[PDB]
Design an enzyme around this catalytic site. Structure first.
Site, PDB file in Angstrom:
ATOM      1  N   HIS A  83     -11.950  12.585 -22.453  1.00  0.00           N
ATOM      2  CA  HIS A  83     -12.407  11.794 -21.315  1.00  0.00           C
ATOM      3  C   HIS A  83     -11.152  11.372 -20.554  1.00  0.00           C
ATOM      4  O   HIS A  83     -10.286  10.692 -21.105  1.00  0.00           O
ATOM      5  CB  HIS A  83     -13.154  10.542 -21.776  1.00  0.00           C
ATOM      6  N   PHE A  99     -12.101   5.672 -10.278  1.00  0.00           N
ATOM      7  CA  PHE A  99     -13.524   6.004 -10.367  1.00  0.00           C
ATOM      8  C   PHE A  99     -14.082   6.864  -9.236  1.00  0.00           C
ATOM      9  O   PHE A  99     -13.860   6.587  -8.057  1.00  0.00           O
ATOM     10  CB  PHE A  99     -14.358   4.725 -10.497  1.00  0.00           C
ATOM     11  N   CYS A 108     -18.220   4.726 -20.083  1.00  0.00           N
ATOM     12  CA  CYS A 108     -17.426   5.941 -20.115  1.00  0.00           C
ATOM     13  C   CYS A 108     -17.405   6.798 -21.360  1.00  0.00           C
ATOM     14  O   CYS A 108     -17.014   7.961 -21.277  1.00  0.00           O
ATOM     15  CB  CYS A 108     -15.997   5.624 -19.709  1.00  0.00           C
ATOM     16  N   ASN A 144     -12.189   9.935 -12.235  1.00  0.00           N
ATOM     17  CA  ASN A 144     -12.940   9.431 -13.384  1.00  0.00           C
ATOM     18  C   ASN A 144     -14.422   9.205 -13.075  1.00  0.00           C
ATOM     19  O   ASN A 144     -14.808   8.149 -12.565  1.00  0.00           O
ATOM     20  CB  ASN A 144     -12.307   8.116 -13.851  1.00  0.00           C
TER      21      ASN A 144
HETATM   22  O1  LIG Z   1     -12.803   5.212 -18.268  1.00  0.00           O
HETATM   23  C1  LIG Z   1     -13.257   4.234 -18.902  1.00  0.00           C
HETATM   24  O2  LIG Z   1     -13.002   3.997 -20.103  1.00  0.00           O
HETATM   25  C2  LIG Z   1     -14.160   3.240 -18.168  1.00  0.00           C
HETATM   26  O3  LIG Z   1     -14.970   2.577 -18.816  1.00  0.00           O
HETATM   27  C3  LIG Z   1     -14.052   3.114 -16.646  1.00  0.00           C
HETATM   28  C4  LIG Z   1     -15.372   2.724 -15.973  1.00  0.00           C
HETATM   29  C5  LIG Z   1     -16.013   3.448 -15.058  1.00  0.00           C
HETATM   30  N1  LIG Z   1     -17.048   2.762 -14.577  1.00  0.00           N
HETATM   31  C6  LIG Z   1     -17.105   1.576 -15.176  1.00  0.00           C
HETATM   32  C7  LIG Z   1     -17.984   0.502 -15.054  1.00  0.00           C
HETATM   33  C8  LIG Z   1     -17.808  -0.630 -15.844  1.00  0.00           C
HETATM   34  C9  LIG Z   1     -16.755  -0.687 -16.754  1.00  0.00           C
HETATM   35  C10 LIG Z   1     -15.874   0.383 -16.872  1.00  0.00           C
HETATM   36  C11 LIG Z   1     -16.051   1.516 -16.081  1.00  0.00           C
END
Ligand SMILES: O=C(O)C(=O)Cc1c[nH]c2ccccc12
Ligand SMILES: O=C(O)C(=O)Cc1c[nH]c2ccccc12
Lengths: 387, 387
Positions: free
Chosen positions: B301, B213, B162, B334
């Site tokens: 973000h 997500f 992210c 997200n």
């Molecule tokens: O919004 C953030 O800080 C994230 O890391 C969320 C995220 C989205 N897709 C992922 C896949 C693996 C680990 C975290 C996330």
């Protein structure tokens, strides 16, 4: 802001200020590998398949390789000894999470020691490995193991492959040159824990990989404007290029699946590379008024004996140009991205020891080539340093 | 060579010359997601778990998300609906191999249209996605789909996560500024095809992600020295930094395993970020004599509503600062690395239609933040362009 941009960037060429290397403490002799490999994977009775492998090993021009995987580890991980009849990714990820950062740390410590400055001065980290198991990537773990400052700017280079030894230099040049005072730690760490698997007569290309791929890690400190009498450069990264050979995507490739990382290799690779290397050379050196390739020192990714032989023949290089390259392939095998860095180290060391006038066997300019999935060719023009 | 280095590099700041975005066609209403999600994953009987998820969705401040995964695709892939009872990586890799490049191509085509120049002018490609299935990485596939020149210099940014929306800008700045005439295509393409899975009482730290997500791809053209009256910059990338928050490794993380990519998000994330954000601001802006955070335009973000609320409170930001950020989170959820670019696009477009003096809501300087595994924070200082 005008003055800001000018002071923000560095002045001269990105230079390699140190090179460190490391390998797992387990030397595997190529002369006895066929028997060991077929025994440990439980295929001792498949004489014909073993003989095919024996032939591959015998013509590999590789005397030994260092391997994290030992008989003991393989005995505790039978799934890794299978071909694809059972899954093995999770077991491999556990191995990678430990071994890749371990080798990286060892190589980096050596590079840092040679460099001779406090690690507090490292501003960036470019970390490369064929694969990484989690998020954070291995770049995070390596920085942690090395005790680097939290503010070190990291970039992880994953699933690029064998040409990445060139890629990281191409990246390091821009980071070092565009940031005054920047000192970039560049690391390539590779292990067959991700690719090792049993033999299959329907996948002879995978068989070739089992005979060529070895383990190792390289580390460099790259920076522009080296401190006089404090830091010592051995090479300058002058110009770089990357290109893809048309219609060759299946020539070299891999897939991360439930059975781990599988790979494919086509016999056409030697021809494909040699048929396009001359153009890489002209595009790189026409601007330097150089047309005689024997006036340059050479560093070529040792993907295979055939590749080296074909490039040598195609470019009419004298028998001495690829000595450092073949030396590394013979003693370490194909360590993917890290190879070219080991060769650069061998080159500067042989130069100093043979009383050469420059770190490039007495020559001013040189070329470094990385080959891999694409088929991709990375070209790096280097300048030696007077001795 | 001195004149060579000067001719080799660019003169001014790396500038964003175009921004394009794309999302799958399927819009998923958040108001009805709990019922759909628990139905398709066979968790209708788990009333307490469903109730918890309903509240998470209701407080998410996300109205909808675009998703490649549809009921039809999920019906044909029951393995993806399970939690971890059965393997599903291979199925997901097949989806990723197709969808990530597809969305990337859509976003890139739009960015190139805006830019208005020939794609033959594209010299570099920085491609980012949470994961990539094979070797070559998706950067190769995307370049192929776009018909880019074989010599375009590629860098794939995988398993960063992210915060990578900031990472790719930090990288683009050095590539654009250290290479005269360079035009860098920067792409971030993400899809929940790799993260979607059924809910689990034994892994509540993995539940919120299923509510936040979403899918999307962003594309930018970055280059220094824009051609007067031909190219048009909307932002300049002035300064960047990356840092890791102390002892927070497990706060945000993921693992690529046989059941696909699993992830965990700790409830402490909002606090960890807000407790370290002030220092990021001081380190970035002290040099510009800026201490009033409300004199800057913002791009954050949107990891989650709480993170935004906590940052706003901690830095005492006016209610208008995070409007663009919250707008993107509300309409897309997200989308990992791509989020901040969608927000940048919204910022400039609104600024032009609201009668502001600059592309940064009438302000000169601005800040863009990326948050992710580490816990890592990417800081990017931006300068708007006069309108
Ligand atoms: O919004 C953030 O800080 C994230 O890391 C969320 C995220 C989205 N897709 C992922 C896949 C693996 C680990 C975290 C996330
Ligand atoms: O030497 C080359 O060109 C290779 O790419 C060989 C190689 C080493 N490790 C690999 C993993 C996946 C695909 C290819 C390789």
């Amino acid at each position: 802001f005008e003055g800001f941009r000018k002071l923000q960037r560095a002045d001269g060429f990105a230079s390699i200020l140190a090179i460190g290397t490391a390998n797992p403490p387990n030397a595997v002799d190529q002369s006895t590998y066929p028997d060991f490999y077929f025994r440990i994977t439980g295929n001792e009775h498949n004489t014909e398949l073993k003989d095919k492998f024996k032939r591959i090993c015998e013509r590999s021009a590789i005397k030994q390789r260092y391997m994290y995987l030992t008989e003991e580890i393989l005995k505790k991980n039978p799934d890794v000894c299978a071909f694809v009849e059972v899954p093995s990714l999770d077991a491999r990820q556990a191995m990678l999470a430990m071994e890749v950062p371990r080798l990286a740390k060892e190589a980096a410590e050596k590079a840092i020691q040679e460099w001779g400055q406090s690690k507090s001065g490292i501003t960036h980290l470019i970390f490369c490995s064929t694969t990484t198991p989690d998020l954070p990537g291995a770049d995070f773990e390596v920085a942690k193991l090395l005790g680097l400052h939290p503010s070190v700017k990291r970039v992880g280079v994953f699933q690029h492959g064998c040409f990445a030894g060139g890629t990281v230099l191409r990246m390091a040049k821009d980071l070092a040159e565009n940031n005054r005072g920047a000192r970039v730690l560049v690391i390539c760490s590779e292990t067959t824990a991700v690719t090792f698997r049993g033999p299959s007569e329907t996948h002879l290309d995978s068989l070739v990989g089992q005979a060529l791929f070895g383990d190792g890690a390289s580390a460099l400190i790259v920076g522009a404007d080296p401190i006089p009498q404090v830091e010592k450069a051995c090479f300058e990264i002058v110009w770089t290029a990357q290109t893809v050979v048309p219609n060759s995507e299946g020539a070299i490739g891999g897939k991360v699946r439930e059975v781990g990382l599988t790979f494919q290799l086509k016999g056409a690779v030697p021809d494909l590379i040699s048929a396009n290397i001359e153009n890489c050379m002209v595009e790189a050196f026409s601007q330097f008024k150089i047309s005689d390739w024997n006036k340059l020192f050479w560093v070529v990714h040792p993907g295979g004996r055939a590749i080296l032989d074909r490039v040598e023949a195609k470019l009419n290089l004298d028998p001495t140009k690829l000595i450092p390259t073949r030396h590394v392939m013979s003693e370490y095998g194909n360590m993917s991205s890290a190879c070219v860095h080991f060769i650069l180290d061998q080159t500067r060391k042989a130069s100093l020891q043979n009383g050469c006038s420059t770190t490039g066997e007495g020559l001013e300019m040189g070329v470094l080539f990385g080959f891999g999935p694409g088929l991709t060719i990375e070209t790096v023009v280097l300048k030696s340093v007077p001795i």
